[PDB]
Amino acid sequence: PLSTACSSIYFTMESLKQIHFLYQYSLQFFLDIYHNVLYENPNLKGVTDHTQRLSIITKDLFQVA
Helix, strand or coil: CHHHHHHHHHHHHHHHHHCCCCCCCCHHHHHHHHHHHHCCCCCCCCCCCHHHHHHHHHHHHHHHC
């Protein structure tokens, strides 16, 4: 489910260029977003239960993106 949501966000982000010419986003930028959510996450620190970590990861992905 997280991977599906991640793909949806990136493609929505890519198609966002239609409403304004300025919004030109590359794949590397979205990869940086996803890796920041994945690696450098304050909320993930101190949590070992995987379900809670995935909930934190998806919420933080939405917010950080």
